[PDB]
């Protein structure tokens, strides 16, 4: 059970410098006398790591209290500790640090390590109380008051203590690196005897891996477990605790960096170079030996002033559809198109987009869209796509090999089938030649399979082009009706009329910025242009490879794009 | 309402030269001081354009009649007009120019433009009667007599007049380019002042786009609308019209050409080069600066002599077909099948192919063909098709759900029926269970209709399996005999033994032809060779592949092949 301590009072932060510390082995591969460059999460060299006393005495009276604030966990943590009396015992990791979300607990008593992954209900001041036995005093008994309750445990790990026994200036510097990558929580560690150095030593020590835990949970924050030798019920005036918190710990945050590591002959990392520290370090990394572009501030979106709405409902929720031949083709323009109602309705069995991802339809802006609507069987649904063959793909409706747009189809057994058969839809089994893309031949001329002419009379070897479509509600899936619409998008160098439901933002000028005019996205700086765009000009390309000038859709003004790249 | 005019009398055509006119802006981008190559519908340079007088005086008496023929619209039209007093007012476009098809009307009156898309009833001589007011004469009132009825309009457009007021040798040149691409009617226009030039002037003026109307109607035909100042009721001797039609309009037709356009520093197209005009233009286009294989005539295909034929005559033309229990399953292999015989002969009532189309039988090659020949009543020959039931589909012939092959039946009254009845064809009505694939059960065991055994002896609830069919020449069509053959084709991963007949053509020597010698395809010229091929070695080869000589399959002469000169 947990015990309530005093308020932390929000101590002001304190920093210190990390002189090239926190370099661990990125791989488990033996390398000898070689310089290897690795891009991974490392503690930056000469960085400001935040340092906290284990026990801090700040009150005028002389109050002693734990300094165990909840610290963030941004892409790993380098945790260093200089101590001599084992008053640091472990950590807890999690997002909310309560029963709602999973949490990790690592604690080291005198015998072994306890690593658990459970829905701990942690208290405000988690910690471990240490009491020595009356006769031995060789080991020290610990009562845990970290969590009130634990539930849904999915991991248990026990091994040799990460932290050895420290049982008078023989302080020890213990450095650890904790990482969370791909659901794995990795512990690297190294322990070194220190002497007469209050802050982090100057020097280089490699951190060998200790363990790779399959935790598979999310971490945002972490805290430190401290050992109390005094009593919370009766706080002594002084010396009840451990020398007013001489022992303390440093915390630094790992960042994505490229390090050049020098494995010596025996395979130990004896030196490292941080590529982003100084120009000399950059030179070392580029030469692989020991001996700039302006970023955009914000994103602006700029679209035309259109308030119309589309008849997409009418096209997709129509009572009747055309036959496979003589397919109905409607033009949709001058309206704002919401494709989320379409993509996320889950009422369509088939939804394939070519030349554009279906989740980005809501973002792009098109000159026009064309909706083709008809009904087919199931085994022929596969025929509506570019590059395919078949009686529909060759005689009825051909999509071009360069088709850009989305084909949508959904089941229509209970709309288009009738018990005795719905023969209101037909197809052509015969034609003199295959179709051209989007060419729709509706001629009913009698076929002439033989050598004799039919003269418009169907006898022998003379057949009428169109055969009926058999729709019955008892038919198999392959023989069932499917209502299909092909939306062909036109993305041309023309002012767009069918838009996405995106909100135009303010125009920020003479500044490097991400811009989006009429669906054209890019990065650069904009300036007033005196270019003589005639009333009909929309775009501009003096070099024919970079859009130097554009017309703003809202206000018809010529703004020329210089790359903010310098 | 319309007014009938006199006969056009089919004036002989007259031509003139177009000195680098009709160049427009292909794409809507700003280009400055750059040479861009564009492939599009352009009027070729130095082309012959047909020129028509607005008013032609050609009769001996001095008749004044308009020259407004209905001219073709072939992939765009360059319409230039040199005039002084606004006699040309607009155009009509359409396929039939009547109520059967939609039509486009563009008219420029004194105030604005009228663009309509309706199925007008255009008369033979559409025109605008133009009259001035009695006091002002600043503007001209126009009476439209170009259509009889307007109905079902699908478009309306009004804007500033295409033709400015021209209200005395300051002739003006107005150039338009009309294109009809992707349901879009695009109009390009430019207006220039011309001085003392009767025909199209020498120079360069670029046409700026005007309108991009979205219109689905196809055009392929058009006419020019003109204005009468004179009176049709009373034609004056002379000068009642406008000076006997000095003004005129020129029509040329666009063609797919590649142009090199030079955008100057201000962005206007200053010069253009027609890459297909002269060799130096070709060089200019190749260097993108302003400062050859012989085609094959026809295709030749030669395959060896057709020798082996299927015994289809032994199947279809056979004297006697077996009963409906012992089908004459006959194997067909190692010979060439001509299915055009049984197809084009069309002496067979039913000819149904499943899994294969009936016209491409001659092109496919099959491992084996199985022919089953027998005699069956009318209705039951209708029954044979996959997936169906009935006494025959369940008790005599077993036909799989997926069946690649053709069922072929013809009437056999004059062959299988006798006056006294042909009882030599026997049919079953009773079996213990339905059949399994291709089981030719000929068992004569007496079936037990009741609960007592028959022991091979008829009696009560004991019946012979085989009843007789009363084939007589007076029977109705349903009860008449039909000779039927089902041909099952085997297409599996094995070499084919039944193949269609290969159609070879004649031989053309000493000419650049496309050739196909026993599957070896190519293009080249063929000459008699004195080479010494062995009995084998159908096609010779040179030092590095690239077959130099071949042997004709039908005639053993060796024809050497020379690449077509390039």
């Amino acid at each position, epitope marked *: 059970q947990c015990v309530n301590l005093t308020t932390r009072t929000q101590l002001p932060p304190a920093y210190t410098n990390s002189f090239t510390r926190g370099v661990y082995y990125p791989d488990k591969v033996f390398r000898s006398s070689v310089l290897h460059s690795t891009q991974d999460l490392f503690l930056p060299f000469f960085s400001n790591v935040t340092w906290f006393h284990a026990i801090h005495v700040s009150g005028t009276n002389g109050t002693k209290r734990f300094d165990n604030p909840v610290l963030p966990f941004n892409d790993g943590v380098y945790f260093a500790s200089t101590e001599k009396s084992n008053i640091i015992r472990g950590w807890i990791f999690g997002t909310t640090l309560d029963s709602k979300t999973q949490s990790l607990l690592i604690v080291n008593n005198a015998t072994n390590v306890v690593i658990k992954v459970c829905e701990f209900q942690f208290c405000n001041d988690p910690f471990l109380g240490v009491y020595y036995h009356k006769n031995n005093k060789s080991w020290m008994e610990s009562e845990f008051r970290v969590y009130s309750s634990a539930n849904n445990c999915t991991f248990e790990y026990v091994s040799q203590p990460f932290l050895m026994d420290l049982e008078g200036n023989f302080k020890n510097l213990r450095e650890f690196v904790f990482k969370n990558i791909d659901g794995y929580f990795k512990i690297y560690s190294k322990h070194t005897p220190i002497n007469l150095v209050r802050d982090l030593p100057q020097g280089f020590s490699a951190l060998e891996p200790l363990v790779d835990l399959p935790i598979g949970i999310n971490i945002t924050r972490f805290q430190t477990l401290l050992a109390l030798h005094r009593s919370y019920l009766t706080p002594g005036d002084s010396s009840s605790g451990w020398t007013a918190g001489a022992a303390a710990y440093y915390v630094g945050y790992l960042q994505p960096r490229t390090f050049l590591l020098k494995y010596n002959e025996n395979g130990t990392i004896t030196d490292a170079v941080d590529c982003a520290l100084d120009p000399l370090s950059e030179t070392k990394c580029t030469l692989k030996s020991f001996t700039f572009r302006v970023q955009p501030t914000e994103s602006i979106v700029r679209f035309p002033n259109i308030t119309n709405l589309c008849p997409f409902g009418e096209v997709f929720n129509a009572t009747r559809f055309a036959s496979v031949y003589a397919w109905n083709r409607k033009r949709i323009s001058n309206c704002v198109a919401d494709y989320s109602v379409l993509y996320n309705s889950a009422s369509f069995s088939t939804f394939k987009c070519y030349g554009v991802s279906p989740t980005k339809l809501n973002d792009l802006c098109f000159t026009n869209v064309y909706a083709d609507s008809f009904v087919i069987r199931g085994d022929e649904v596969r025929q509506i796509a570019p590059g395919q063959t078949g009686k529909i793909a060759d005689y009825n409706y051909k999509l071009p090999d360069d088709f850009t747009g989305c084909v949508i189809a959904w089941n229509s057994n209970n709309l288009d089938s009738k018990v005795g058969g719905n023969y209101n839809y037909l197809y052509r089994l015969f034609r003199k030649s295959n179709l051209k893309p989007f060419e729709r031949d509706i001629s*009913t001329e009698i076929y002439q399979a033989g050598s004799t002419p039919c003269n418009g009379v169907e006898g022998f070897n003379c057949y009428f082009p169109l055969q009926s479509y058999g729709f019955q509600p008892t038919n198999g899936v392959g023989y069932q009706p499917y209502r299909v619409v092909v939306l062909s998008f036109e993305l041309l160098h023309a002012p767009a009329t069918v838009c996405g439901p995106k909100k135009s933002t303010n125009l920020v000028k003479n500044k490097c910025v991400n811009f989006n005019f009429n669906g054209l996205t890019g990065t650069g700086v904009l300036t007033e242009s005196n270019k003589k765009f005639l009333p009909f000009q929309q775009f501009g390309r003096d070099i024919a490879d970079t859009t130097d000038a554009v017309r703003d859709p809202q206000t018809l003004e010529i703004l020329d794009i210089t790359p903010c790249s310098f | 309402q319309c007014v009938n005019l006199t006969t056009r009398t089919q004036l002989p055509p007259a031509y003139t030269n177009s000195f680098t006119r009709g160049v427009y802006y292909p794409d809507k981008v700003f280009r400055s001081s750059v040479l861009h190559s564009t492939q599009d519908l352009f009027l070729p340079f130095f082309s012959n354009v047909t020129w028509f007088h607005a008013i032609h005086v050609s009769g001996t008496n001095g008749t004044k009649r308009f020259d407004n023929p209905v001219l073709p619209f072939n992939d765009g039209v360059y319409f230039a007009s040199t005039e002084k007093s606004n006699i040309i007012r607009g155009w009509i476009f359409g396929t039939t120019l009547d109520s059967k098809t*939609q039509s486009l009307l563009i008219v420029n009156n004194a105030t604005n433009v009228v663009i309509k898309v309706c199925e007008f009833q255009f008369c033979n001589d559409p025109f605008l009667g133009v009259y001035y007011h009695k006091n002002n004469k600043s503007w001209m009132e126009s009476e439209f007599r170009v259509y009889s009825s307007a109905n079902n309009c699908t478009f309306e457009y009004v804007s500033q007049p295409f033709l400015m007021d021209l209200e005395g040798n300051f002739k003006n040149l107005r150039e338009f380019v009309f294109k009809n691409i992707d349901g879009y009617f695009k109009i390009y226009s430019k207006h220039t002042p011309i001085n003392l030039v009767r025909d199209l002037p020498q120079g360069f003026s670029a046409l700026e786009p005007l309108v991009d109307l979205p219109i689905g109607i196809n055009i392929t035909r058009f006419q020019t609308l003109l204005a009468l100042h004179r009176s049709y009721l009373t034609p004056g001797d002379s000068s009642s019209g406008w000076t006997a039609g000095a003004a005129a309009y020129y029509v040329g037709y666009l063609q797919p050409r590649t142009f090199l356009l030079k955008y100057n520093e201000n962005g206007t197209i200053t010069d253009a080069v027609d890459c297909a005009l002269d060799p130096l233009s070709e060089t200019k286009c190749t260097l993108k600066s302003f400062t050859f294989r012989v085609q094959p005539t026809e295709s030749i295909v030669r395959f060896p002599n057709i020798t082996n034929l299927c015994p289809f005559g032994e199947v279809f033309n056979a004297t006697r077909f077996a009963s409906v229990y012992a089908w004459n399953r006959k194997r067909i292999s190692n010979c060439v099948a001509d299915y055009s015989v049984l197809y084009n002969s069309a002496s067979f009532s039913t000819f149904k192919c499943y899994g294969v189309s009936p016209t491409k039988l001659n092109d496919l090659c099959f491992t084996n063909v199985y022919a089953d020949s027998f005699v069956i009543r009318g209705d039951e020959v209708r029954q044979i098709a996959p997936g169906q039931t009935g006494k025959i589909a369940d008790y005599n012939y077993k036909l799989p759900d997926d069946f690649t092959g053709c069922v072929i039946a013809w009437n056999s009254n004059n062959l299988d029926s006798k006056v006294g009845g042909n009882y030599n064809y026997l049919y079953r009505l009773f079996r213990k269970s339905n059949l399994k694939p291709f089981e030719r059960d000929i068992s004569t065991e007496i079936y037990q209709a009741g609960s007592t055994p028959c022991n091979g002896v008829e009696g009560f609830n004991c019946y012979f399996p085989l009843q007789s069919y009363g084939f007589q020449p007076t029977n109705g069509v349903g009860y008449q005999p039909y000779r039927v053959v089902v041909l099952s084709f085997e297409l599996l991963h094995a070499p084919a033994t039944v193949c269609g007949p290969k159609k070879s053509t004649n031989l053309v020597k000493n000419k650049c032809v496309n050739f196909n010698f026993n599957g070896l395809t190519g293009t080249g010229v063929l000459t008699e060779s004195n080479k010494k091929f062995l009995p084998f070695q159908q096609f010779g080869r040179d030092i590095a592949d690239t077959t130099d000589a071949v042997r004709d399959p039908q005639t053993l002469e060796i024809l050497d092949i020379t690449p077509c000169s390039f």
Partner: nanobody
Amino acid sequence: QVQLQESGGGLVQAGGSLRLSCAASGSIFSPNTMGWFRQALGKQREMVAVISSIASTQYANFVKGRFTITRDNTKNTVHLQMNSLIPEDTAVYYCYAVDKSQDYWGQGTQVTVSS
């Protein structure tokens, strides 16, 4: 919403004649193609004839030489003059409008001939 008005069927003895008519009251963009289709109870749709407004005939062999089709351009109507009837020919008929956008159908005309 193109509507096809059909009228002129009924009960007639063997050897009689009837006069059907289908009228398209809808949009009918640009050329059409007016057709007549047959359906007897238990069978599929059999098109009698799909004559276009311009040309192309398209007569079937079922009733060869017996029915005829008249086109009225003023109202763009079609009439089926059906003579020399037989009980086999009897079925329910539907007029067919190809149109420029989509194809429509009628509501039906019962034709019965027997003795």
